[PDB]
Amino acid sequence: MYDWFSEMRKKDPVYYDGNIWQVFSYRYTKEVLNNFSKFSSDLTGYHERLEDLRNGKIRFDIPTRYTMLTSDPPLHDELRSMSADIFSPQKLQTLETFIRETTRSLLDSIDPREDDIVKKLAVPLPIIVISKILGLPIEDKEKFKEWSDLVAFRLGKPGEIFELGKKYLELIGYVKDHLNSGTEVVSRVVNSNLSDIEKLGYIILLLIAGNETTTNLISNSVIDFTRFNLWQRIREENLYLKAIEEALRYSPPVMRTVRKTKERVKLGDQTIEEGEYVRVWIASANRDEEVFHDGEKFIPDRNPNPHLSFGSGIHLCLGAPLARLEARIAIEEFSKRFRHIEILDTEKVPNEVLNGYKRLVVRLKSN
Ligand code: HEM
Numbered sequence: 001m002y003d004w005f006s007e008m009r010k011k012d013p014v015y016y017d018g019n020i021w022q023v024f025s026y027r028y029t030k031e032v033l034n035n036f037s038k039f040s041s042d043l044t045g046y047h048e049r050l051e052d053l054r055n056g057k058i059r060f061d062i063p064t065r066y067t068m069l070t071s072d073p074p075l076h077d078e079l080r081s082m083s084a085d086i087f088s089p090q091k092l093q094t095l096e097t098f099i100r101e102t103t104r105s106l107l108d109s110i111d112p113r114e115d116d117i118v119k120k121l122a123v124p125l126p127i128i129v130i131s132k133i134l135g136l137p138i139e140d141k142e143k144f145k146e147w148s149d150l151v152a153f154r155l156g157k158p159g160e161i162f163e164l165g166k167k168y169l170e171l172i173g174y175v176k177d178h179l180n181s182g183t184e185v186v187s188r189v190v191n192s193n194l195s196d197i198e199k200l201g202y203i204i205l206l207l208i209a210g211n212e213t214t215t216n217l218i219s220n221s222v223i224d225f226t227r228f229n230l231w232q233r234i235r236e237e238n239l240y241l242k243a244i245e246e247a248l249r250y251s252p253p254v255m256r257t258v259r260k261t262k263e264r265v266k267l268g269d270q271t272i273e274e275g276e277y278v279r280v281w282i283a284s285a286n287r288d289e290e291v292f293h294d295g296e297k298f299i300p301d302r303n304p305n306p307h308l309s310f311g312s313g314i315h316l317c318l319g320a321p322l323a324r325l326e327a328r329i330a331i332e333e334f335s336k337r338f339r340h341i342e343i344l345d346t347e348k349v350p351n352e353v354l355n356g357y358k359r360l361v362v363r364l365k366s367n
Pocket residue numbers: 041068069070080130205206207209210211213214217252253254257258308309310311312314315316317318319320322323
């Protein structure tokens with residue numbers, strides 16, 4: 001991947017293959033993400049469908065097509081304003097003790113002789129925390145893991161990031177069943193003037209959409225710290241903050257995102273017609289030598305680090321404060337708890353957009 005990224009950054013940072021456009025450089029990736037009025041996120045016809053969702057002309061549709069992720073202002077801003085305070089660093093910091101205690105309890109379960117830390121640590125932690133945050137109970141741990149795994153790039157369905165089918169219908173039933181038992185942010189959504197379809201979409205987005213990405217950050221951090229032999233230096237030079245930021249830059253859990261042009265636009269030397277998909281490679285931008293000195297090197301105290309792994313602009317990841325907090329606490333506690341790590345076996349996430357591990361089997365020496 002990354003050698004190809006370098007080639008495109010050098011010869012062809014803005015590339016048309018006869019179907020869609022792909023962007024590989026930092027400057028044009030950032031330009032795309034921030035220019036919401038020319039590069040639209042409404043890939044599912046949310047704006048076009050809004051009135052008939054709300055007046056009930058549209059009776060049946062896929063709830064997760066219609067969330068803030070696939071909308072433009074003002075609809076986007078109005079949606080996000082209902083939960084933006086909950087996910088701010090100021091408000092999340094209350095949760096620090098709960099997350100730290102949950103982490104150490106997950107660490108307890110680890111057989112240091114041989115264990116899968118994706119299965120023991122990285123997968124359960126985001127699910128437990130978001131369930132706490134939303135007041136939506138984990139009734140079946142296995143169902144919640146399966147629901148979290150529904151998240152995927154979906155070829156030919158732009159904007160759609162959920163695998164559908166029987167599992168998805170079960171998720172919907174679950175949310176309907178616990179609508180009225182949630183915390184205050186859930187109540188905001190439920191009591192709003194959104195259509196039922198939008199309400200379901202919104203709740204599912206918050207409950208499920210962030211689990212695997214956060215799991216992937218934790219897994220990728222463990223891999224990166226181990227492979228480049230940084231555990232001691234990070235521990236002793238207290239580099240947790242900047243090291244996790246560098247893991248974000250170097251091993252982005254979300255490799256790319258996409259936009260659709262609202263009008264003819266110019267991006268660098270190229271002219272993109274209206275109604276074109278523009279895929280923006282976060283992973284490649286994150287190594288742009290014009291922005292990051294020695295971009296191919298993992299530097300645990302890297303500074304500055306304006307990486308695009310949470311995006312940029314108005315859609316800048318709502319969960320970024322939360323993901324940073326969980327990851328930092330997970331790594332800190334893990335680092336405090338174990339002296340030595342050997343990677344015994346790995347299985348990557350196999351598909352296009354998500355970058356992380358299905359299995360991470362390690363041998364550890366505890367203190
Ligand atoms: C390491 C973990 C994570 C990474 C790398 C990540 C990445 C991203 C990226 C790149 C975007 C922008 C997509 C775009 O511009 O089209 C985004 C948006 C979003 N993310 Fe995350 N994310 C993470 C964790 C989370 C978590 C934990 C949650 C929820 C609890 C979450 C919820 C959202 C939401 C709701 C949006 C839409 C924001 C909007 O449209 O205004 N993410 N994320």
